[PDB]
Amino acid sequence: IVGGYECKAYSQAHQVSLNSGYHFCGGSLVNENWVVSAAHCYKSRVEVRLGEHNIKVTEGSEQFISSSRVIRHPNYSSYNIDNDIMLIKLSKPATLNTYVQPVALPTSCAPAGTMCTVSGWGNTMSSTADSDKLQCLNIPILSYSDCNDSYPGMITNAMFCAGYLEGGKDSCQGDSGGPVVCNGELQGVVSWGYGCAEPGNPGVYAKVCIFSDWLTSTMASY
């Protein structure tokens, strides 16, 4: 997260860290057994770390759970980073408490101009912002017109742009797979962008509201 602020600890209780000996991507707890992330973050096995604030300090709030299953969207395309969404089944259910709470799936697609929250432990590009401490950022959803104007012909139905065309504030590498929360629902998944916080290159996010049938179907009947 570039140009952000340190989240109030545990204010994003759904936020998880994907760990393979080190933090490499974010994700969102959706219920006790499943985590939503980005398909481009795929690894056959990962450790999910819940209840984190400072990922390099033991706080007493953490839960470290290994994955039992990692499911990439069936139409994920790495060429164009289309359908950049994945499901992670926890080997054991998470414990819901004051530190760990699921985030709701969206019951509608949020329109352009909606202010959202993005968070993560990715690069901050700043000497005073510690990427070790969960970072928060307020970002508005951009129109499809602005999004495609910025990345001509690269924006599919499965994506939406959010951020600032002026640059300066953005999600970045290491934030990938993390949440975009709007009005208390999970609207997006950190997915891609050209650089981080560069003028004219806003962040691109997987559009969660078009995947609700696949998500619930996968979580329920398997």
Stretch that binds Ca ion, among 49-57, 146-154, 164-172, 173-181 (CB under 5 A): 49-57
Give kind and range of the element (H or E) at residue 36: strand 34-37
Query: Is residue 10 close enough to count as binding Ca ion by CB under 5 A?
Result: no
- Catalytic residue positions? 40, 84, 176
57 is in an annotated binding site: yes
Q: CA 161 from chain center: how many Å? A: 13
Residue 141 is given by DSSP the state B
Query: Is residue 59 close enough to count as binding Ca ion by CB under 5 A?
Result: yes
d(CA 75, CA 45): 20
Query: Is residue 52 close enough to count as binding Ca ion by CB under 5 A?
Result: yes
Stretch that binds Ca ion, among 50-58, 93-101, 120-128, 165-173 (CB under 5 A): 50-58
32 is in an annotated binding site: no
2 is in an annotated binding site: no
List the one residue out of 206, 214, 28 whose CA is nearest residue 109: 206
List the one residue out of 212, 209, 170, 216 whose CA is nearest residue 193: 170
Query: Is residue 134 close enough to count as binding Ca ion by CB under 5 A?
Result: no
SS3 106: coil
The two tokens of residue 69 are 């299953």
The two tokens of residue 134 are 């969960």
Environment class of 113 (CB within 10 Å of its CB; exposed 0-12, middle 13-18, buried 19+):
exposed
Q: How far is the CB of 54 from Ca ion (least distance, A)?
A: 5
Query: Is residue 64 close enough to count as binding Ca ion by CB under 5 A?
Result: no
Asked if 177 and 192 count as a contact pair (C-beta separation under 8 A), the reply is no
The two tokens of residue 133 are 């401490």
Minimum CB distance to Ca ion smaller for 57 or for 115: 57
Stretch that binds Ca ion, among 15-23, 54-62, 153-161, 204-212 (CB under 5 A): 54-62
Minimum CB distance to Ca ion smaller for 32 or for 59: 59
Minimum CB distance to Ca ion smaller for 54 or for 173: 54
Give me the residue whose beta carbon is nearest to Ca ion. Answer: 59
Detail the residues annotated as belonging to a binding site for Ca(2+): 52, 54, 57, 62
Q: Using CB under 5 A as the criterion, which residues of the chain lie in contact with Ca ion when the complex forms?
A: 52, 54, 57, 59
